Write a protein that binds this ligand. Structure first.
Ligand SMILES: *[C@@H]1O[C@H](CO)[C@@H](O)[C@H](O)[C@H]1NC(C)=O
Lengths: 380, 127
């Protein structure tokens, strides 16, 4: 009974997350086919993704539970199709802002994909099905990155034809979406946990770490373009992305397997990994070596998954499955608020309008400051 | 007082190219936004391209994107604009403007620039 919805959802997720053009977005946007400047991409286009994601988050959550999930998933597929159609044939800065708005809509709709299985799968089968869907998405992204690198290097394909493959993949995923069973119920519509201090503390770090991680991810490719202009040197954005994703997945798997009291060792290890994230970001900033910037990105992505995995394990240790949804929804909303404030102040043209050559000094400082403040309260 | 002066505009056949140079003076210019605007008869003043002198960041309007490139020859305190594959829709008077670098600077809004040139005309004739 659980096999059919699970297999269909896993097929949709795999084909939606398989996007060979995602590692080479900056080389594509700044290439001859779009002629977008680095300042325009970083301080006018890219910030719009955070704004739309923050604005659309809560309404999409409320719509999802009430419409029984499936319709939102189909909407996510439609948004994927529109986003890549615009990416393939769009032109100018305004069109890219529309693309960013639709991508933010796509991201805000990902809650339906993971919340869908609750209403169609028995509570006894929740763990394995959720693990299956997460692993399928991770494998899809890694395979897409590896294929993107293989085609660019060996096959010699252009960045235009990488977006054609992504459009075909998302179209197939949408075609898979129209066959999922309609959920017959929902957790809230169709059926005070923060009072605990531990939940508040762990939620805070998760929210702040997630904000920093998403801010760094949105601009890491622009930093690589700055250090190694794509138009004159060989680039390995697919291989680097694939290796970083695999390292993060291995770190997340390792966290679960090794058994240790995270009530006592949680804060020390967390602070250490925040310091490691700060050091990797500082290396990315200062280092003039493109290989060192790749290594720093790998270290940051692997260490963050070491961090967020422990944070999520500590948050959900006592929460109910019903409470997972709203607690984590609030936590991602607050992380989006923090990221929006950061983007407005730093990256936005209405703030400091800082180029990518200085942003990563602010992100390393951000992570170091996170670790420093969290370290306090020890004595006195 | 800052003083912007342009040169290079002229009568150019449609499809050809043209270069425009705006030499700022009266001050040491390292923390200024230097931009180009244009105005044709019966229309409003339109952004063309801008450059950040400190960081070298460049901005373009989608109308001229891919054809116009804005650079900086600091050796003479001049910001240059090269125009390629000109069309009849590019006929206008071009004004270079200078804005001080500071917090919350709207690069493309003409009201942001407190110094403006006398304007150099570029009329594009289609045979
Ligand atoms: C971008 O600029 C290049 C060189 O100026 C030009 O050949 C190309 O057609 C332009 N592309 C677009 C879509 O603006």
């Amino acid at each position: 009974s659980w096999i059919y919805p699970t297999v269909i959802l896993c097929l949709f997720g795999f084909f939606s997350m398989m996007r060979p053009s995602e590692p080479f977005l900056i080389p594509y946007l700044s290439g001859p086919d779009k002629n977008l400047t680095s300042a325009e991409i970083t301080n006018e286009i890219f910030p719009v993704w955070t704004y739309s994601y923050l604005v659309l988050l809560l309404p999409v959550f409320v719509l999802t539970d009430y419409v029984r999930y499936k319709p939102v998933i189909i909407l996510q597929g439609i948004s994927f199709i529109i986003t890549w159609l615009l990416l393939l044939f769009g032109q100018g800065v305004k069109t890219m802002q529309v693309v960013e708005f639709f991508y933010g809509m796509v991201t805000a709709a990902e809650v339906a994909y993971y919340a869908y299985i609750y209403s169609v799968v028995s509570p006894e089968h929740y763990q394995r099905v959720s693990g299956y869907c997460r692993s399928v998405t991770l494998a899809a992204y890694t395979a897409g990155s590896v294929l993107a690198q293989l085609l660019v290097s060996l096959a010699n394909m252009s960045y235009f034809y990488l977006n054609v493959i992504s459009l075909a993949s998302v179209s197939v995923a949408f075609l898979f979406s129209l066959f999922l069973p309609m959920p017959k119920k929902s957790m809230f519509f169709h059926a005070e946990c923060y009072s605990s201090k531990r939940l508040f503390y762990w939620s805070l770090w998760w929210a702040f770490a997630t904000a920093g991680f998403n801010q760094v991810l949105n601009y890491v490719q622009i930093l690589w373009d700055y250090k190694a202009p794509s138009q004159d040197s060989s680039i390995y954005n697919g291989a680097v992305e694939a290796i970083a994703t695999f390292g993060g997945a291995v770190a997340a798997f390792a966290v679960g397997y090794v058994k240790v009291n995270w009530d006592l060792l949680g804060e020390l290890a967390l602070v250490v990994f925040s310091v490691v994230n700060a050091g990797s970001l500082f290396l990315m900033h200062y280092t003039a070596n493109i290989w060192a910037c790749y290594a720093g990105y790998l270290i940051f992505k692997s260490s963050y998954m070491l961090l967020i995995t422990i944070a999520v394990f500590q948050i959900a240790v006592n929460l109910n499955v019903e409470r997972y949804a709203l607690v984590f929804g609030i936590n991602t909303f607050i992380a989006l608020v923090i990221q929006t404030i950061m983007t407005v102040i730093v990256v936005d043209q209405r703030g400091l309008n800082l180029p990518v050559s200085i942003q990563f000094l602010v992100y390393g400082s951000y992570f170091a400051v996170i670790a420093g403040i969290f370290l306090m309260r020890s004595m006195y | 007082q800052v003083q912007l002066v342009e040169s290079g505009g002229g009568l150019v056949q449609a499809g050809d190219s043209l270069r425009l140079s705006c030499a700022a003076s009266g001050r040491t210019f390292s923390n200024y936004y230097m931009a180009w605007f244009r105005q044709a008869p019966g229309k409003e003043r339109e952004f063309v391209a801008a450059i950040r002198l400190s960081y070298g960041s460049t901005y373009y309007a989608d109308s001229v994107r891919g054809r116009f490139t804005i650079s900086k020859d600091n050796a003479k305190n001049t910001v240059n604009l090269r125009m390629n594959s000109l069309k009849s829709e590019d006929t206008a008077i071009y004004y270079c403007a200078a804005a001080e670098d500071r917090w919350a600077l709207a690069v493309r809004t003409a009201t942001t620039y407190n110094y403006w040139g006398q304007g150099t005309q570029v009329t594009v004739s289609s045979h």
